Design a protein around this ligand. Structure first.
Ligand SMILES: Nc1ncnc2c1ncn2[C@@H]1O[C@H](COP(=O)(O)OP(=O)(O)OP(=O)(O)O)[C@@H](O)[C@H]1O
Ligand SMILES: Nc1ncnc2c1ncn2[C@@H]1O[C@H](COP(=O)(O)OP(=O)(O)OP(=O)(O)O)[C@@H](O)[C@H]1O
Lengths: 579, 134, 112
């Protein structure tokens, strides 16, 4: 009895209740049975994506046999799970491998009904370099029924066929479908009591619905038969785990939140406060970014719509930031990341500055097999696969060539971006911020700091000339940043001076910032090179304050703190001595 | 026993003071625990840049076990670190090394407290492109 | 885990050595090795230092070859090494000139 040494009796497991029942797989089960009922091509092969119920069908078959839903032709058969030890038990002694398959392949038909062998992984047969590694026994003996049911991944099936040939001719390929959310939930309900019992917790029916629905939206890398269960089982454990540390599974408070802990996606944490998530966002973005209030609100509102998943399931929040350079076109984006991930550096910067249609897509998505270097995904695939709700920044997306813009067309509408590898990303939960300098030709007229209607249209003209409308039509909003009125500049100077303090590592020397209104005006007035935005303020500070400070530091004329005054644009502010 | 040859008892080392005390990372250790406390597929993996401290978390698991900060579900537990040697001690005689590995698994489930096995450098689990991964 | 578990515990003291660009490859391919090893920058010696080195090695050359080396010869090797072998660093560049010159004397003796 080789089978009693090397294999599991699947009908034993069925009779003992060790296998889960299956729902909705009845036709696929019938297909495997109908194939077994054949005299030729009697060996079905369950083919599908990993996790697509392939052995669920098999486990289901075992139950259908003991329950007599199988033609008597086949019902009288016994089912065994083989391979692995069946081979590896031997090692030394050439040919033992054949001896191991041989009595299995004899006992399988020796009076004690017909035994169907299960090779859950057909693809692991054939032979590693062929080596006549007992695989030849199968075709050789295959005429004598010896029925075998097996399974393989779609990808693996391809490999099986190409590697052996005879297997394609001997097996009946069977596609196994991924269930819909509705079907998935039915599956979950069947298994619901197993989890409730296993964990000692209850599950809300809406929770099962949520798991399947939520998984379909936030676990694109895992097929539903598993993804939905992962949320159910993980959640049940979470309940039992907390309970039994030093109840039931709630659709919202348990599963929605569980999925978010697992996958990210803050909007599914169903947070208790849109004050400490949205309100503060506008305030703090406004606190640091002066002016461009319009943009801040545009982003905050676009972000607001993602709360609870209300925003479109296939469209990233998306923006195009136009406006005067020095207006915070990328600073806002950093501050948004600064809020979203509580850290500005978590933003995925995309170096759009360097683009050619011949490299432009490949550096983002990588390439296919056969090309020097695979490590696909430089900027997008490699990040989006790990960061589902990251925020992307395209610094001068306008320099993109149509091929990239095409990637962006997908990104911005059904963002199931296909990587060079051939696998999609599905980044609909990300935030996409893009920038352009096209409006410079009109905003530099300086005729009003808040973008005027004439200016707006002229700018959008350029945008529409440059990008195809197809792109523009997929952007949540296009915002032209306001120019930095002198009003803004005074507020900004204070902010910048504080920023300088904040970034000054170990502030032994620290700024007293005795700016007084006079130096505030000095920096604000003389640094207000309106047509370059706020950026010149920095240059002014470096030129007038920091250089002198650094020198006094080098000369040790300052021990700590930092005196400030105005000595008298010719005053050059000029910081005082200290000690 | 295969664990006595191929694995390190992290909890013994914790007990012996050979592991650094873990500082902070309260949510990560709680997360790790919640996953280990699962009934189905209870198998967390710590992901992050090298130099982050994820091993320290594993040491943290051992420490939580030694001092029973671990939930009832997991208190009656041991933590072992599986060396690659279970497989990398030599594949001479095809299948033997896989058998040693399975041997380890038998010991782990078989009764003797909730033995949890730590897999360092999990990339090694990839085997020869599936195939040898068994 | 080549050297890994031991390096990570302060055991198995290892002194490594490689070229800047080789290192670059280590940093990129493994990364963790850069976190396991302490980088020490090694600097090319100046001509003066090079000569000091040559003087120290002088007896190895004199004994091996059966020749006598003048101090100005060693200074010359270092100066010429820097001036005429710009693509190769001084220790070897100077030694090649010294060693080969010494060898030449020895070879020349057997040429007659
Ligand atoms: N509204 C603002 N409030 C405070 N600081 C600002 C503001 N706008 C700009 N700055 C400062 O000036 C710089 C603005 O940088 P940013 O790159 O957004 O300019 P930019 O327009 O993006 O340049 P470009 O269009 O070429 O990316 C920042 O370094 C920031 O410190
Ligand atoms: N939070 C912490 N608590 C206690 N010790 C820590 C902590 N973080 C780091 N350490 C110490 O520094 C090391 C953190 O590195 P660790 O061993 O996790 O390397 P790693 O993160 O696994 O990277 P790798 O992938 O090279 O193993 C630990 O070995 C520990 O000594």
């Amino acid at each position: 009895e080789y089978l009693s040494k090397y294999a599991i009796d699947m009908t034993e497991q069925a009779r003992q209740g060790k296998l889960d029942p299956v729902i909705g797989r009845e036709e696929e089960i019938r297909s495997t049975i109908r194939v077994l009922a054949r005299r030729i091509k009697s060996n079905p092969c369950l083919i599908g994506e990993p996790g697509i119920g392939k052995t669920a069908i098999i486990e289901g078959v075992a139950q259908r046999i003991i329950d007599d839903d199988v033609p008597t032709i086949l019902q009288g058969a016994k089912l065994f799970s083989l391979d692995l030890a069946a081979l590896t038990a031997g090692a030394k002694y050439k040919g033992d491998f054949e001896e191991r398959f041989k009595g299995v392949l004899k006992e399988i038909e020796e009076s004690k009904t017909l035994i169907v062998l299960f090779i859950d992984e057909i693809h692991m047969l054939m032979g590693n370099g062929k080596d006549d590694a007992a695989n030849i026994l199968k075709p050789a003996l295959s005429r004598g029924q010896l029925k075998v049911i097996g399974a393989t991944t779609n990808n693996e099936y391809r490999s099986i066929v190409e590697k052996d040939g005879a297997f394609e001719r001997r097996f009946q390929k069977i596609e196994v479908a991924e269930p819909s959310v509705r079907q998935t939930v039915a599956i979950l309900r069947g298994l619901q009591p197993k989890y409730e019992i296993h964990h000692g917790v209850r599950i809300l029916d809406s929770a099962l619905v949520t798991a399947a629905q939520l998984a379909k939206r936030y676990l694109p890398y895992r097929r539903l038969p598993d993804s939905a269960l992962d949320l159910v089982d993980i959640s049940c454990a979470g309940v039992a785990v907390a309970r039994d540390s030093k109840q039931n599974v709630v659709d919202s408070d348990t599963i929605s939140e569980t999925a978010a802990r697992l996958t990210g996606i803050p909007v599914k944490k169903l947070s208790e406060s849109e004050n400490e998530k949205l309100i503060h966002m506008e305030r703090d973005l406004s606190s640091e970014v002066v002016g461009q209030m319009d943009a801040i609100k545009a982003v905050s509102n676009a972000v607001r719509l993602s709360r609870s998943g209300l925003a479109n399931p296939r469209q990233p929040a998306s923006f195009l930031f136009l406006g005067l350079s020095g207006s915070g076109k990328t600073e806002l984006a950093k501050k948004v990341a600064g809020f979203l991930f509580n850290d500005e550096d978590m933003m995925i910067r995309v170096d759009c500055s360097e683009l050619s249609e011949k490299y432009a897509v490949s550096k983002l998505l990588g390439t296919t097999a056969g090309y020097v270097g695979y490590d696909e995904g430089g900027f997008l695939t490699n990040q989006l696969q790990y960061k589902p709700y990251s925020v992307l920044l395209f610094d001068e997306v306008e320099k993109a060539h149509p091929d990239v813009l095409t990637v962006m067309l997908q990104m911005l509408d059904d963002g199931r971006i296909t990587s060079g590898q051939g696998k999609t990303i599905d980044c609909s939960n990300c935030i996409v911020i893009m920038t352009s300098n096209l409006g410079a030709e009109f905003i530099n007229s300086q005729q009003g700091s808040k973008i005027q209607e004439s200016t707006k249209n002229l700018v959008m003209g350029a945008v529409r000339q440059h990008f195809r409308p197809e792109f523009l039509n997929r952007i949540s909003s296009i915002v032209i940043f306001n120019k930095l009125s002198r009003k803004a500049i005074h507020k900004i100077v204070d902010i910048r001076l504080k920023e300088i303090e904040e970034r000054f590592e170990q502030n032994d020397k620290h700024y007293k910032l005795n700016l007084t209104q006079e130096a505030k005006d000095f920096l604000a007035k003389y640094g207000y090179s309106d047509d370059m935005g706020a950026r010149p303020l920095n240059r002014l500070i470096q030129n007038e304050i920091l250089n002198k400070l650094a020198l006094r530091i080098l000369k040790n004329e300052i021990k700590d703190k930092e005196t400030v005054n105005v000595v008298l644009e010719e005053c050059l502010e000029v910081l005082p001595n200290h000690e």
